[PDB]
């Protein structure tokens, strides 16, 4: 008659905050014989002994819900993935806290993993809704990383499928390259100026440093990025007037801990409704089979609906992500972050603040400059397209017709013979 909860968490003070959230979770459900015990673990210098300490501690603990959060590492190591793999072997449910990569979009990779923070692909939702603000229909997508940018491209095409509008050009390329000037010059020559970017820190810094010297930050250009593109050396090289998005309480983990504790509390006290309550095995030495009500309790988590907590209404989708998070539409004004709007569950609310664009006036840029250089193509047709070589030096002769009318010629280009 106890419920064990494993907290894979960073600091001892936030461990005490987690234990206080466990203590506060015992209030509204009475003095029933069920109890809530908490076991916390910390960092390890790699991903191997993370998996080691996590697997022995969570097998010896026999937990139900697992809360994992390790942002603060100075290296690029980020993955809480072996904890999710170890639990998803036994289908033990994990509440991820502060991981945001879209590789958790596949439940085949993560069988018993749910999180109450949305991944970056849901930012594309705002990237549709902002188009609804400005009636834009020709966008330029720019994606460096292929680890998750295929999912963002999928989400953007899904959002454009309902209106049946087309993205004019998408770009997938090398993570961590220096020759993105070719990418930007190939992206220059369209009628669209709305540019959408989602990358890492150094890739964003590279394309900012390229596009600043390539005159693609002035009038007409629209720069719409995500949260990872306004920090670090990308923020150091950031062009002004850029529109970005920010998660409200994205780095605030402490209230998110208590919100997840309330989610676990209502999930457990809904789990006691149905019968055949199963127990976590001793999977260290002796037990290899999975836990029985894994998909059952996961479907219980699919029926989650909340009206309490600091975040308030938290709800899981069909992919186990976060529904309806408020965002902060931020703007960069003279290398200072300026709040210029908020994002509802499904709506965009501009505030009374001033929106400053990277170009000239602060009006909204109708940045569809129609191409006056309409590139005409044809073929050598004998009655219609007479093709002659150069007359004197790359020129033509103003000949006359038989009826007193000069033959109108034009300087075209083309090959001479066949390709083999």
């Amino acid at each position: 008659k106890i419920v064990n909860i494993g907290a894979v968490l960073s600091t001892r003070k936030h461990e005490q905050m987690f234990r206080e959230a466990v203590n506060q979770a015992n209030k509204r459900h009475g003095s029933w014989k069920i109890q809530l015990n908490a076991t916390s673990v910390t960092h390890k210098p790699n991903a191997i002994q993370m998996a080691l300490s996590v697997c022995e501690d969570l097998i010896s603990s026999q937990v139900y819900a697992i809360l994992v959060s390790h942002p603060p590492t100075p290296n690029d190591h980020f993955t809480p993935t072996p904890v999710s793999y170890t639990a998803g072997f036994y289908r033990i449910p994990v509440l991820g806290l502060t991981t945001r990569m879209s590789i958790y979009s596949d439940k085949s990779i993560h069988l018993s993993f749910l999180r109450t923070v949305p991944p970056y692909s849901h930012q594309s939702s705002v990237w549709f809704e902002m188009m609804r603000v400005y009636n834009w229909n020709h966008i330029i997508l720019l994606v460096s990383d292929d680890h998750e940018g295929r999912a963002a491209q999928k989400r953007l095409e899904t959002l454009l499928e309902e209106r049946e509008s087309k993205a004019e050009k998408v770009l997938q390329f090398d993570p961590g390259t220096k020759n993105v000037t070719a990418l930007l010059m190939e992206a220059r020559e369209l009628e669209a100026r709305v540019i959408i970017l989602s990358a890492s820190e150094d890739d964003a810094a590279t394309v900012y440093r390229a596009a600043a010297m390539l005159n693609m930050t002035g009038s007409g250009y629209v720069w719409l990025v995500g949260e990872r593109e306004i920090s670090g050396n990308a923020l150091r090289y950031a062009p002004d007037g850029i529109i970005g998005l920010q998660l409200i309480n994205g780095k605030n983990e402490s209230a998110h801990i208590s919100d997840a504790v309330g989610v676990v509390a209502q999930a457990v006290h809904e789990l006691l409704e149905k019968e055949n309550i199963t127990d976590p095995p001793r999977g260290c030495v002796g037990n290899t089979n999975i836990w029985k009500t894994g998909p059952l309790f996961k479907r219980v988590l699919m029926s989650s609906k909340y009206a309490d907590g600091v975040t308030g209404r938290v709800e899981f989708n069909e992919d186990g992500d976060r529904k309806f998070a408020n965002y902060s539409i931020m703007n960069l004004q003279n290398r200072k972050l300026v709040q210029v709007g908020i994002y509802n569950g499904t709506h965009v609310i501009p505030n009374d603040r001033k929106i400053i664009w990277p170009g000239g006036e602060t009006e909204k840029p109708r940045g569809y400059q129609m191409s006056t250089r309409l590139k005409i193509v044809t073929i050598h047709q004998e009655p219609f397209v007479y093709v002659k070589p150069t007359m004197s030096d790359g020129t033509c002769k103003e000949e006359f017709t038989v009826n007193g009318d000069p033959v109108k010629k034009v300087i075209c280009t083309g090959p001479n013979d066949t390709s083999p």
Binding site: N46, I48, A51, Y85, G88, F89, D106, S108, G283, I290
Partner: protein
Amino acid sequence: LNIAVLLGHSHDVTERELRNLWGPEQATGLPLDVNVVALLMNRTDPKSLITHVCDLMSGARIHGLVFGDDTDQEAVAQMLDFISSQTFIPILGIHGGASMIMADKDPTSTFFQFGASIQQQATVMLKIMQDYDWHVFSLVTTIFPGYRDFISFIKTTVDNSFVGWDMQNVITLDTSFEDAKTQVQLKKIHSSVILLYCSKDEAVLILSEARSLGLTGYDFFWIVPSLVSGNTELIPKEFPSGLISVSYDDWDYSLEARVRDGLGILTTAASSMLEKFSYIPEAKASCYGQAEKPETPLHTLHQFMVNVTWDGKDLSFTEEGYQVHPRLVVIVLNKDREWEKVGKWENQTLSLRHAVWPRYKSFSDCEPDDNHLSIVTLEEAPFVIVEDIDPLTETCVRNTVPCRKFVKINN
């Protein structure tokens, strides 16, 4: 180099045969040292898995892992995908859950599986539908994962085909159904051929509703992958007798040929890299006692074994981490409520033993009879002209009808 073959099996494959398997093989030794260590394990829990893998990586710097499994749980390979990200060892998955196919990996992972992706399997199923001229189809999709990619691959396959498909509305399902909205979704179906991508638990309920809704006539057909149809040991009574499935589980290609091909791929990659690069053995020291930023190697076999051929076998691997020309077997659920090999798949050609397609009519014991009329004819120059199959579509053109000619070899 040092190569470990750990095979957790319930079927008794003895370890001494696995050790002496290298004997009659190519013992010419293009590397100076080609050593194998065979192991068994009767408990495949992930603690012991990581323990034995770290023991083998500490076991004289083993540069290649060969793992199979007898149990039917794919999540073992879900652990193994992590292990390539740390041990930096080329790992091949042989049998069981190691042979069960996961979707997407990491670029810093040298882990590979003997099997076939779901898109290659859908290509094989649509090749079946091409070869039997079944064009009017539907698509029943539950919330079992990979389903949106499955729908997208079918749509991009239809858009890139000269077949002339007739896709009906893609049937979507919310959850474990109350038979209220999914009732209407199944009653949207009135076509013949139905594709089904669901789970093994929900397949019995969906096909039981389809038998209740009369969607299991012998005019109709049902084609599923092996991700929903499990092993041969569990065949429920609710499945329609005639269910076409596509699986990688060959029985002629048993565990001995599997580990022989795995050792052949590993030694071929190591030998061909030895003729390109000099100092081939590069291994991690141990799983214990290290900080962050692990000592990454420079020349690995991940960027090298794109081409490999073992005595004619196209065992090459894709850039995404799957087989280029895998081995697939098309089976049906015959009248004896079992699974019989209908056709194996070559590099491109769908070899079909039964080009005659029988009815497999015994779905219930109460069905109407004698609707397919077996009709014979004869070639005459102004009446019946019979030509070969078209090379562009591998399909008879729209005014022509399919037939078969019984062509013998000799006397």
